[model samples]
Target chain A: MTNKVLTISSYVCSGFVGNRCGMIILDSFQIQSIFVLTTHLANHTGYPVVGGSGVLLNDFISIMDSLEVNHLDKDIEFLVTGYFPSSDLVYETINRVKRIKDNKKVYFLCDPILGDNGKMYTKSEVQDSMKELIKYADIITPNATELSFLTGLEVNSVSEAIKACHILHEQGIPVILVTSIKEGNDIILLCSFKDTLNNKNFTIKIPRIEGDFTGVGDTLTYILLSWIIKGIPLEHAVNRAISTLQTILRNTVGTAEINIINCIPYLKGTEESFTITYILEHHHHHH
Target chain B: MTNKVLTISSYVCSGFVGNRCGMIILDSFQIQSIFVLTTHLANHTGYPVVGGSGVLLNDFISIMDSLEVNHLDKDIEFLVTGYFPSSDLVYETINRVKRIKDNKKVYFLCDPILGDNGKMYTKSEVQDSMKELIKYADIITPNATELSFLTGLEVNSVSEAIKACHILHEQGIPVILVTSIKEGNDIILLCSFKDTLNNKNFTIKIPRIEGDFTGVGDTLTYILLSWIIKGIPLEHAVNRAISTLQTILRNTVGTAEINIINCIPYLKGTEESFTITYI
Candidate 1:
């Protein structure tokens, strides 16, 4: 059976962000994605000027209803949600995911694209809706700022991100991958998983390229989810995702978009050279 | 500057057709695209139930205005138009293409998707507008049935298809590639290029896979556009595109959608073993 993923995200006609970024990255790794656009724009908002409209709640329902009625939603083995333009769409995805999860197991990866660099790009209502969206996701990828926004906790340090992940874990997310935690010239990736008895936490620090490009978070989330869904272990998957994004971005520093098209052959890299430092692995009363 | 393409087509969330198929095929060849969805669909209407809405004329104009005002339209070096939902949008595209061409030379590939097997999926108005759109396009990748419909001529044979291409070539289209001309189990691809004096026409017969699959025309159009833009010879580009689609569809016979992800590596194949019979 073909492994299919249904992705809800931004669809910029011109730029490589949201679903466009997600589609290419996932497809390069030999995974197909069904994209439902949250917003259809001429370019990413990062551009000085942008044009387009967000998909309204009713339209979102119409599309989802068609998928469900036609049973086109049947083949989706994984679900990835990103860059929702409205809180209602986030709730609608919550509803849709529940429907898809009714008959078969669907791995839900929520990129939680609230914002980066300690800012919320969306409204607080959308943030609140994303918080509601937390429990439905098997794995949630949020940058440090988004983690802080989602949990109402500070996320400047690894310790703080771990706290935010605990709050998220309490809300029923199994695995939490916190990305883009700035620490000087480098960025740290914190992976937190809530076990039956205890929680496992690890941090991998990589040198952050000092340049701007859209789709870094979206690409990371999809690559990470692809690796994880393909049965790669969590830490190894994180490394591959990081390594993949690193290679792609290193070539993208001087360019317009993420250079995934050229670097796609090197995506599933044979090397896992990044360090994975386990910060905490603990239990209440067991070893 | 990045070589960019603005593709106006259907955006099916599930199926691989229209812009979805066009995007992947072009991107795999390392071409960036700016997509405008003529219709946002859950899947191709090939399914029992398909949903989502087509872009309204106002919404379409809003997007074009956005591209224009933001100067996002400046970088587009090529335009690939597929499956406009309305006659008005086809006329809108003509306006947009003219505007894009005002400052720079934009190579427009008009895939006049007016149904196949000698049928009209859209209104006759859309058919009429596509005729006007022909003048703005540098090349057109219409299936044999679409050619016949566009020219009010029969396209059952190579000669008939060539006559249709001549009509298209006369209306400012420099290159015409008529795909899916049925000649028994084999398919013929007729290429017509209007030169300074006379029109040049050639056909490559390919083994047509029996089962139906979406995106064959779309995949062919894009791969052909990519190779042509990259300066490959017209005949060789057509061959590569045919080889590309043949490999993709051969894997897609029993599948639900076109198996592009797995077959993408072999898309621009090194071996063009498919016979390019000059019919």
Candidate 2:
């Protein structure tokens, strides 16, 4: 039997202007028998209502309990979190996630919504709560400052950053991926990883983004979970995730906005046919 | 002389976290550059500070005025804006940017720090202020809601979002890229340009990232600007931008912390290289 995959996301009938919800739903829609549990309202008041095109975090977490319980294909495989309403909710949500974790491995890919440089972009509590959430995540995808906070180490140098990743692994969660390391006139990184199975740690020096975007993270997490659950090996999973995200990001700049990627069928096991025509820079990938 | 681009930025020697003195120095750094110009402050402090990570809008203007008399480089070429500190400053900033439009190519790439999607990431006025900024921008990089707000269009489907992009073009500027757009399990968009300029626009899409972090915008802007300045074609720049960002993001996943990214020689431009090797 295939690994049962479940996505607990904010379910909005209509998609936001620049969120990954539309793409996520589209990707999940491509799945044949996959179960999707979504939350529309947080507590009440039609929470997360669209105000001039923005969705609230309150609406983002309304259906988590239901998402966690109702659809049980097989131990509720993977839970992907994005654009949560509040850090307090995030904490409560993580607490609940911990419960299910013991029954079966529940990996949290936290996209913490706090500010960098010890700042809080959202609610101050959100950053406060996400700090705790980082401790529990199986894999954390932080930019720079987030990683610094997660590891309690100032990330001024690549070696120091790599060492911070080790500190995170030592703390419990092993996988740490830092994003947006600005070099000079360009961007780059010193990526590191800890193989949970091999009981070893390894780091790869990943490349930099030629361009930038708003929801690249949303798209990235979706693809990562999708590929991983698709049963692709970890190494391949990483490759596919980056390839897919790069393609999407490329289109964003080509068309100059968050353009829709048309690789959902292949990603969700719905279609055996994978068309390369829509690939933004696939030709260059070869060159 | 390569425009003798003088970047107005905050440089900290070392001191208390929020000491206003360092902020003053930061302001002075840009003021002395005498090349890069700016407007008023927009965020919390409503002005420039010496001890911050960046230059304030007001301070940025001080530098721009210096260029007027210095006769160092008229090729101020591009007055790139990123990570605004306030929304109140947006009005003055936009007004000043509009004035520059008639003379030089004044482009505004609004990240809409107000919030990602009604999350209030920045401050309240940012949402209000960005509305003014968008109208004045040559090209905008707002995620989704920011796009919707600018166009006043619903964006649940491809048609509505495309129409929104079209609406934005009708206003003044022609380039609009709606980000974080999802059709199903993938991110999407609807970008447009002037019909006179070949009106080249298409919906480009790609996979998503599982890991979330701060500063993606900072990185994206840096790369996009880099490519734009390199005189590379838009399409080629777009493709390269995505490719480069992916490599960085993949590298990001392997990274221990985000700030450490600043340490990478290539990322910091010490060596100017970006080819990642897998383990």
Candidate 3:
């Protein structure tokens, strides 16, 4: 049987983001993908102007309903959700996630895309809806500000992000990734798992590639999920993901988007170029 | 500048066919693709039931117009048109093809997808509209049945296929490929160029893999287009595509779909395992 992932996200005709990013990444792994387009745009939103329509709740539910009847919901081992156009779509996706989880083990990776640099396209209702879905996520990759917004905490430093991750961890998630925490010259990603005894927490400093790039966060989430599905441990998965992302960023001299096509070999690379530092956590409320 | 291909075709969420097949094959080459969906399907129609809706012409035209304003239509060096949902979609695609061809030297590869084995999904108006688009195509891939339908001649044999190809060549297309003319446990594909002085015709007898398949025609068209864009000559381009496709078929063990995922290394391999004969 073929390995498959159900990726419900945006589909751009021009630049790489949303479902397009996952399709390209998973296709490189010789993996099959079922892409449900949440929004159909001519390009990513970073462009001066964008076109196309978002998939509404009715159409979204109808497509998933078709999948269920067609028996496509059975064999899928992973689910990646990105770029919901509204609150209703997010809540509906969470409902479908619960349904699929009851049948088989579909590892859910949720990239809670609130925003970076204090800017957001989603309303507060969308965030609240996403918070309800967080309990179902096996993995969540939230940026510093999204972590702050999701946990109702200010996540400016590594400590604040870690505390915010703990709040999410209490909501029944095993793996959490706080992407792009700014600390001095470099950016750090904090990975927190629920297991405290043997599996400790770790953080990796990502070399900041200076450019106006879209889809960077989405691409990282996918690489991490792909590695985890391949049975790599959390720290090692983050290491490989960072190494791969850094490679793609360095090679991408873009016209304002990720050069996913030009970075195929980089994505296929197996070299371990980045390292993660183990973070010590002691004297929490659990003690 | 990044090289791009504008592929206007059907988009299937579950199985490989129109845009999905091209996206996978073109992704293997690391060539970027801009897909304009004519139909959004749940899976190939070979299934018991297919879901999703056809992209209406208004949505289609708006998407293409966005591509135009965003300067995506400028750098596109090739265009692949497949799987129009209606006669109107076919005619509108032909109009857009004319517009793009007027702006730049975009190599247009038209897969005139009428039907095969005497079965069709399109109406008579669609066929007539496709025939009008035939005048502007740089290359066209049609099966023997489609060739017969296009040229108003019976193409049950290789000789008749060659004759029909000449008719298409007269309509001002440089390259014509008639895919899958079956004869006694083998399938032959004919490649005809407009050049009669130095360049002659060739036919490649393909080993028939025993199985029901969908998107076989679409896969062949994309591979042939990729080879042509990579600067391979017409006959040799067909040879590589056939070799690559045969490799994929041999590797695939499927659930009524092309196992494009399991056939990655085969797509990347360059060994010439198939041969073509100059007819």
Candidate 4:
């Protein structure tokens, strides 16, 4: 059986006033199943991914319901969340999670997609809405600023970031990866994982490259989720993800346009593979 | 040389969504390359196909100029029109045909998408705007009611639909294919084609099946255009298109839901083998 991974995100129309997020990714490569939950948008363009922006939430559910070959409890293995249209969907997802809690693992990986580049893309209430899912998530991946807001801590440095990660780690929220840390000459990617088997905590760091881009967190979180789904160790998964990001950097496509750079690779699948064993470690026991 | 097919259609958010239409079809299957022109409100969503849809006449020229791969005067071979967003697109297309006049064969396959069944999908203004392209079209494919609106005759009778086809056939507009015909028993698919070289008219008929599905017209028009691009004769192209529609119909997953039926075949080279044969 193909490892079923369902990515819940936004789809759009292809003309002026339409969104390109769904079209960008769908046109890139092969995907399992797409549930585009939006409204009043038309995809007149029949590109790689036929434009489906006008598809509403009800339509999205109907599409999902149609994809049901069996009961939802037995068939659906994972539900990955991306930019949602409303908090209503977020709560609805939580309710859906409850029905599947009988032996099925519910790993909620958040891009905390409220905004990007030190600004909010959605309404402020979106942050408040996201807090509702904190209890249900297996991994909550947010960048420095998002971490600061979520944890009520100022993640100004690597140490401060780690402190915030530990706070979340103690609450059974093992992995807290804070990305886009702006240090003087360099940037950093910090990962804190609490080992389930040993009851220990581990934090790793990676030096970041310069540039701004959309979907970086979305990409990183997704790739990590794929690795974890594949049963790869946390340290190995982080290393491979960072290396993949580096390989994308080496290709000189968007050195000038920062936002385009992060998003372009995500439009399609990554062409290169990466390895990041430099930040390897097992979680240590520390109450 | 790759056949360059230009599809003119309507988008939701702004005037003419060119790239989205081109990409979706090409990506669904293997195609060399495509150029899309959105003539009307192509943006129903919050996105832009090309520079926010109000791509002035100069903007369209600039797009062709920027392509820089071939001569604007001599390179294009086939032009396909679908949904009409504006009257300007019709005029733009006609001017393009004139510009490439002398040495090229410009076959215009027009799908009069303004109206359907008993009502107009867009506004009456859009329908009026679409009339501009009718005069220049080598072939205009409209459903039954739209043909009636264009020819000023009630297409309630098969004979009346056939007469309307004859009227367009007489006006030097050689071929007029009536799609989505509604009557007592079966749907009427009628058309008139003039053998330009021989000075003879070729009219044909396809009795329709009883299920009404959305976007079938778009699919049928596109399939017919594909057959024409491949150098198939008009009769054979029409037969094949009908056969394709039949195959899609036969493969009905359940009671017809347009959304589900449309995606039944992912077009992963399946259509090429699903041969359409007629009596």
TM-score per model over all chains: 0.94, 0.40, 0.94, 0.54
Winner on lDDT between 3 and 4 is 3
**Per-prediction interface RMSD in Å:** 1.9, 24.4, 1.7, 14.0
lDDT of 4 at B268: 29
Global Cα lDDT for candidate 1:
0.81
B1-279 per-residue lDDT for model 3 (tens digits): 364799988887877888888888888877777987877666767777677777777777777788888787788889998887687888888888889888678988988878888676655667888888878888899998889888899888898888999898988888888888987789998888898777778888887998867788888888777777778787777777778888777766763777776676566555566676887
Give the alpha carbon lDDT tens digit for every residue of A24-113 in model 3. Answer: 888887677788888777777776667777777777776787778888767888998888888999988988999989978888898887
Model 4 interface RMSD, one decimal:
14.0
Number of the predicted model whose DockQ against the real structure is largest: 1
DockQ of each candidate, alpha-carbon based: 0.63, 0.01, 0.56, 0.07
Worst 10 residues of 2 chain B by lDDT: B11-20
Candidate 1 local lDDT, residue A258: 76
Report, for every candidate in turn, its global Cα lDDT versus the true structure: 0.81, 0.45, 0.80, 0.52
Candidate 1 residue spans exceeding 4 A from truth: A1-3, A196-199, A254-256, A281-287, B196-199, B275-279
- Tens digit per residue, CA lDDT, model 1, A224-263: 8888778998788889888878888877745457777777
Q: Quality of candidate 4's docking, in CAPRI categories?
A: incorrect
Worst 10 residues of 4 chain A by lDDT: A11-20
